[PDB]
């Protein structure tokens, strides 16, 4: 995200970037929230 | 019809006579043992298009230890009461210079009138009851123990000879029917005297807030 705000991106790519950054800092604290399809690493096993 | 309604008016009136008898006012003994026929011959036979109107049932009583303190008992005519009737009764209380009042509501209230009863707090404190609630004295029931309201010196020896603070007592909220039977505001301690099967008698205390 940092290089794509220092290179002047299309500003609608950034929405799909801050959206996924929101998901990746918001799953690590609370994974089992209702809605928001879960994160998983291997064998379909969701994270702790 | 009308015999059930005058039965209700007798039983409500008797309940209010024990109520202000228990709050600490001056009540003659003749209207406490008032049989239905003395009511029926004094105030009238039927309230259906009749002589007990729900007007001329009002009761004005006076305190024992001070002759200034009086309390008025209003029996409103219309079923649900607005603000205008509360301004009528508050006007009569304004010109007659009386502070305490009861409003035995027939069917129910309106919430802006209730906000018009809680807003005059430091002067003109009015209380709201219901006809369905006043047909039995809850203090004489099997489960309800003896409540005795405590003066300020006695609260000082409670909080001084147990070495408590004031918040460290058990509590009671001022919306149960017994603390509305005694008319208790926030900050006052009721004493409850109940008989037990381990010691014989137990005295506990409650802070009203």
């Amino acid at each position: 995200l940092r290089r794509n705000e220092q290179n002047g991106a299309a500003a609608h790519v950034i929405a799909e970037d801050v959206k996924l950054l929101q998901f990746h800092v918001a799953t690590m604290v609370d994974n089992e929230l209702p809605g928001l399809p879960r994160a998983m690493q291997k064998s379909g096993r969701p994270l702790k | 019809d009308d015999e059930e309604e005058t039965y209700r008016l007798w039983k409500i009136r008797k309940t209010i006579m024990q109520l202000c008898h228990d709050r600490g006012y001056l009540v003659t003994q003749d209207e406490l043992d008032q049989t239905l026929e003395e009511f029926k011959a004094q105030f009238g036979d039927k309230p259906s298009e009749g002589r007990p109107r729900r007007t001329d049932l009002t009761v004005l009583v006076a305190h024992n230890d001070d002759p200034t303190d009086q309390m008025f008992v209003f029996f409103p005519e219309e079923p649900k009461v607005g603000i205008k009737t509360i301004k009528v009764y508050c006007q009569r209380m304004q010109e007659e210079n009386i502070t305490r009042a009861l409003i035995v509501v027939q069917q129910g209230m309106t919430p802006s009138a209730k906000q018009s009863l809680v807003d005059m707090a430091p002067k003109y404190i009015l209380e709201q009851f219901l006809q369905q609630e006043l047909l039995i004295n809850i203090t004489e029931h099997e489960l309800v123990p003896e409540h005795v309201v405590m003066t300020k010196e006695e609260v000082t020896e409670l909080l001084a000879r147990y070495k408590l603070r004031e918040n460290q007592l058990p509590r009671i909220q001022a919306g149960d029917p017994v603390a509305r039977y005694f008319g208790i505001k926030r900050g006052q301690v009721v004493k409850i005297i109940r008989p037990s099967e381990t010691a014989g008698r137990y005295i506990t205390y409650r802070l009203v807030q």
Binding site: S43, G44, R45, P46 | -
Partner: protein, 98 residues
Amino acid sequence: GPLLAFLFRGMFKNLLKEVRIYAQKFIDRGKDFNLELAIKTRIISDGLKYSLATGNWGDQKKAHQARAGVSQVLNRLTFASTLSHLRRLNSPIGRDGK
């Protein structure tokens, strides 16, 4: 029968699906078409052997939405333990309800 048949339709469908996905890339060039190299053989074999080997009656990448407890290990203490284990029914109602 009616468990390995249900297990077999879902891997005949999948093998025909990668027959299509191998078929479309080899037809845009218009060269020819082949099937002895189109058929990936690990689908049916590793799928039946997988869901018999571990119990979870489904796929490997959906290993938590599956009804486990089918295809378990045969019991060999006494001969009537074995004859009871080969003759056993089971109902899929959950085992914490009351």
